RNA sequence: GACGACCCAUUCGAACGUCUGCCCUAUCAACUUUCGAUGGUAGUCGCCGUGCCUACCAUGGUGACCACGGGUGACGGGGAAUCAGGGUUCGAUUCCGGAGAGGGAGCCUGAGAAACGGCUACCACAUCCAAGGAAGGCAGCAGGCGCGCAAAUUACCCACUCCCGACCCGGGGAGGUAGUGACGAAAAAUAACAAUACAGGACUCUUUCGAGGCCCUGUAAUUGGAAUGAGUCCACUUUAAAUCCUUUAACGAGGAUCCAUUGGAGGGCAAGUCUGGUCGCAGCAGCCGCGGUAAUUCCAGCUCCAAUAGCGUAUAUUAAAGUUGCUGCAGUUAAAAAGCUCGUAGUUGGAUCUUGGAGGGUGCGCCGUCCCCGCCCUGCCUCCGAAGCGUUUACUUUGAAAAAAU
């Protein structure tokens, strides 16, 4: 300990949702410092060699990266343990694949190919909205991108379509009763749904009652709610499953029925 | 007794210049098969040639007559020679290289540390 | 029922129990750390010492025999202890100034049988196992 | 590196009545030791305990439904259990033979291809038995339902074909060197 | 209260005329031996209702 | 095609601050401050809060709801073991948080250290010396001494897993890899099938004698064909390279083996109403008890039992133990109601304030049976939302927040 920043991760003390095995070694990658908090991220190495199967070694993951093969949000990233995350793009070119890091209904970064457009833009949730220096205002998104001069409607918890080459917000969505939502943490991590209610507490802690396209209702902390568009009208790709969440029995019913017969 | 080399789970992996797949080798009833026989035999299914089809892993199963492994076949012999683990290239008659075995070298370096800069001095001393 | 029954009265019940636990001998022994403090063996299971002398001890009635123990100074704490030497003629095998591995009876610290004030038994000499010695698997090395 | 024990000994140790019972089981069931039985008395007690818990739960109770049905389906795949059973109320009223009956050893008897729970175990432990592409030497196995049909001698053990036997082949060359020539 | 002697220590062990080991058979490997036990005990083992009998009897 | 900088945010953090939960002890009952104990007020200090420190000024703060003091086979937790249920005990130790690197104290650098594979003093230890000097800290990896009941190689590699650096390229006793390894856990070999040969029992036939007969087990007699790795071994696999496993040509099972053990056989307690020997001797025996001349307890064999690649023994502790008793103890006489009453804390407290008809789950062959629900035979006010907004709670109920391993 106690004099400085930790540089190692004991594997096992890594986040479950990477789904690294128990045996293999002692240490997991441990996310570099970056645009996404370490728990809530997906080090490229895990993406290249743990989800996509392009790499075997970590030696290979590096060999891939140094080529420049891979861009995150458009701008070649060359670090093994780069902390990619929710709403990130990731583009492997000489292979033609665009993927958006967005959740399972398990709560696992999903392998989700997106079109060669779309790859252009990402939706960021506003975290803070700011009068910076010289009297300029700025918004700050989840992914740690600061955009100056935003339009005055935009308020904390709203979301915001960023261009991506250029930065540049190219509109927005208000947080209001009835907006489509993505759940980014906690028990309900991955469930998508409309809203219904925000219960408000002074001092601390606002809950958001969500209802899914199945009249399934649930709550989380406001911190955990991300706005992604208008009911039935997401502003991004959703992964197969539309973040639905099915009981372990329903889940069994689908698994045996779709196959050992049903094509 | 004929064999049969079967390549399961294929991936075309451009960003490392090679097609990577499992190798499933039936040998019905004896055991086995040479790594060299396997690379020769594969070389002719993927239209590639031996020296681009590295092969590794491998464990004959339980009781006899099968062996599952893993193979790679590289699009440029250059691309292999560079994407390549070095120990892999060494294994067949194209790569070999220097040993030590390691503590002789560490000892050399620690001897060198004593001596102010120069150090080349320490090289002539080792 | 000798014991309040109020929803509140956790503290009285909890504490009344703490007070009576003492009478338990196993409990008290453990809390007073007696095994560390009084006992010849440390609070360990076995203990090795040097043989001072060989005793023929006078088995209690209604039994009648000469028992055959050694007196041993435990190296660990110089404590003086007498230990039984089991089986037929096995004294034979331990000599004065010997060394020996001693162990409890299996009585909880309470002497065994007719054998009076002896609470331990020899197990090894020749570092070498009375059993292996008695059988003649192994010898009185030297 | 996690590990667990697979058997449990009985509280008590000398109850003629229990000992006889176990011996009859070893005999019918070409078993090797008491542990061999104890291992199953243990397997069963946990199943029964699993069952009993479940049976105390409300029916329809997502926890009772989801895990009850699973325990049953698992118990049926192995033939251990049957449908009306195939509810929890019936596993409660079940027993050890029902498991013991599914091991290799007794099957290789049960269709001629051994004629002894005996013969069976030495056959199995000696590599002359595949469960369809795979030799299985574990007289201890547990033959799954739709796997019952695929059990047969192996591709090379002699029956199963393949020359003779390191001892049969000795005998062929046993009538060869002397009685043929010098 | 101790005084006394040991002269006699080991008197019976040393007076007990040694016996051969003799010999004979191997008894059987694991499960096979269990099998012989089960047939001798239970198959064998038919028993009579003789009001019982024994395992290590003479005449 | 080959890094700096200012300021802000970010990320990894840091440092402090909230509560609520900790072992034993009263043969520890009052404690804490003139070397600040508790508070005011202002400053100095610190990254910053703060008696941190200092002045002045108050005289506080804590305690039977166990403070204070002392003790400790106390690092704390996730966890582990023991399974009715309740519980009972452990936790140094693969993770998290905290602490230290001979003992003590100080400090430099740097964003981060009060760092010891930095330094510096003393203190305790040890070393070299040509005797003036000079250099050191395995609670890092191996190894060694001492200690003990007790614990492995002075071995190989950065290929895996990851880390660091100027770094794809180097470096890593992190870590992997082999060796030792009955903590302990999994799989489970040391021999299967006929035949004669026989030894036998339910079945049938017969008045009986007697004979047949199915199911077979032994038990020899050897046969007779039928078998597999344990070893050994071309080849090949494993992998950084090897080993072993998992792979196999050539070999490898007639018993005298390719040879299974460790405790028990009087009771509890499974198994000698033995044979030789001894004669309350040697020994056995947790306990009860055996042995003093027909010893089923000994000492040996023979024989048999039990657990079985394991088994005995000692010991901490747990279960058993409703012998610590919540659940769920006893106290007239068995171990145990104070001689009696008052009585504070604590505990404990009377009655009495609102009253069929269909919707949805799974069984049985369009019919119904059996739950569950708003009903029949109850937030006010502000003036649908919003807001006002709560009389306090405990309780219980429904959510979120809830490390992974386990």
Automatic annotation (TrEMBL), chain B:
Residues 89-126 are annotated as: Disordered. This is 40S ribosomal protein S24. It comes from Oryctolagus cuniculus. It comes from the Eukaryota. PROSITE patterns: RIBOSOMAL_S24E. Keywords: Ribonucleoprotein, Ribosomal protein. Residues 99-117 have a biased composition (Basic residues). GO terms for molecular function: structural constituent of ribosome. GO terms for cellular component: cytosolic ribosome; cytosolic small ribosomal subunit. Belongs to the eukaryotic ribosomal protein eS24 family. Residues 89-98 have a biased composition (Basic and acidic residues). Signal peptide: none annotated. InterPro entries: eRP_eS24_sf (IPR053709), Ribosomal_eS24 (IPR001976), Ribosomal_eS24_CS (IPR018098), Ribosomal_uL23/eL15/eS24_sf (IPR012678). Pfam families: Ribosomal_S24e. GO terms for biological process: translation.
């Amino acid at each position: 300990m106690a004099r400085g920043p930790k540089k190692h991760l004991k594997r096992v003390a890594a986040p479950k949702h990477w789904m690294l095995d128990k045996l293999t070694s002692v240490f997991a990658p441990r996310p570099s410092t970056g645009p996404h908090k370490l728990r809530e991220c997906l080090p490229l190495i895990i993406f290249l060699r743990n989800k996509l199967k392009y790499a075997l070694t970590g030696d290979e993951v590096k060999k891939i990266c140094m080529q420049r093969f891979i861009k995150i949000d458009g701008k070649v990233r060359a670090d093994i343990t780069y902390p990619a995350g929710f709403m990130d793009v990731i583009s492997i070119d000489k292979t033609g694949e665009n993927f958006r890091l967005i959740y399972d209904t398990k709560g696992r970064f999903a392998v989700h190919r997106i079109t060669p457009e779309e790859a252009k833009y990402k939706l960021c949730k506003v975290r803070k909205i700011f009068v910076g220096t010289k009297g300029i205002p700025h918004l700050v998104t989840h992914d740690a991108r600061t955009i100056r001069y935003p339009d005055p409607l935009i308020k904390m918890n709203d979301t915001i379509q960023i261009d991506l080459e250029t930065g540049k917000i190219t509109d927005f969505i208000k947080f209001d009763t009835g907006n489509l939502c993505m759940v980014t943490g906690g028990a309900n991590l991955g469930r998508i749904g409309v809203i219904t209610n925000r219960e408000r507490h002074p001092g601390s802690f606002d809950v958001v009652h969500v209802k899914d396209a199945n009249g399934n209702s649930f709550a989380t902390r406001l911190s955990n709610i991300f706005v992604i568009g208008k009911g039935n009208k997401p502003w991004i790709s959703l992964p197969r499953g539309k973040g639905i969440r099915l009981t372990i029995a329903e889940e069994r019913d689908k698994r045996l029925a779709a196959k050992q017969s049903s094509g | 007794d004929t064999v049969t080399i079967r390549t399961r789970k294929f991936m075309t992996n451009r960003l490392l210049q090679r097609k990577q797949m499992v190798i499933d080798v039936l040998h019905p009833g004896k055991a086995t098969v040479p790594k060299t026989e396997i690379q020769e035999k594969l070389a002719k299914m993927y239209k590639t040639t031996p020296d681009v089809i590295f092969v590794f892993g491998f464990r004959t199963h339980f009781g006899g007559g099968k062996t599952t492994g893993f193979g790679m076949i590289y699009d440029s012999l250059d691309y292999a020679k560079k994407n390549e683990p070095k120990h892999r290239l060494a294994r067949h008659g194209l790569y070999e290289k220097k040993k030590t075995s390691r503590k002789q070298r560490k000892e050399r370096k620690n001897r060198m540390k004593k001596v102010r800069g120069t150090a080349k001095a320490n090289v002539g001393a080792g | 029922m000798g014991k309040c029954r109020g929803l509140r009265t956790a503290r009285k019940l909890r504490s009344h129990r703490r007070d009576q636990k003492w009478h338990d001998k196993q409990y008290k022994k453990a809390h007073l750390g007696t095994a560390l403090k009084a006992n010849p063996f440390g609070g360990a299971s076995h203990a090795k010492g040097i043989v001072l002398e060989k005793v023929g001890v006078e088995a209690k009635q209604p039994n009648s025999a000469i028992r055959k123990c050694v007196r041993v100074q435990l190296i660990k704490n110089g404590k003086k202890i007498t230990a039984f030497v089991p089986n037929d003629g096995c004294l034979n095998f331990i000599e004065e100034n010997d060394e020996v591995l001693v162990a409890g009876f299996g009585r909880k610290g309470h002497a065994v049988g007719d054998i009076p004030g002896v609470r331990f038994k020899v197990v090894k000499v020749a570092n070498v196992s009375l059993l292996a010695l008695y059988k003649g698997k192994k010898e009185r090395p030297r | 590196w996690v590990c667990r024990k697979t058997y449990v000994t009985p509280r008590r140790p000398f109850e003629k009545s229990r000992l006889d019972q176990e011996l009859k089981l070893i005999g019918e069931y070409g078993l090797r030791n008491k542990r061999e039985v104890w291992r199953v008395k243990f397997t069963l007690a946990k199943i029964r305990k699993a069952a009993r818990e479940l049976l105390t739960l409300d029916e329809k109770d997502p926890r009772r439904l989801f895990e009850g049905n699973a325990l049953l389906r698992r118990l049926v795949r192995i033939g251990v259990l049957d449908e009306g059973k195939m509810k929890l109320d019936y596993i409660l009223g079940l027993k050890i033979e029902d498991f013991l009956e599914r091991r290799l050893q007794t099957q290789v008897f049960k269709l001629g291809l051994a004629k002894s729970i005996h013969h069976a175990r030495v056959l199995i432990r000696q590599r002359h038995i595949r469960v369809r592409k795979q030799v299985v030497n574990i007289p201890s196995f547990i033959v799954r339902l739709d796997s019952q049909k695929h059990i047969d001698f192996s591709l090379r053990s002699p029956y199963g074909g393949g020359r003779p036997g390191r001892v049969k082949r000795k005998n062929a060359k046993k009538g060869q060197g002397g009685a043929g020539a010098g | 209260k101790v005084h006394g002697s040991l002269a006699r220590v080991g008197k019976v062990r040393g007076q007990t005329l040694k016996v051969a080991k003799q010999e004979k058979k191997k008894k059987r490997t694991g499960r096979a031996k269990r099998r012989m036990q089960y047939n001798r005990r239970f198959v064998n083992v038919v028993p009579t209702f003789g009001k019982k009998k024994g395992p290590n009897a003479n005449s």
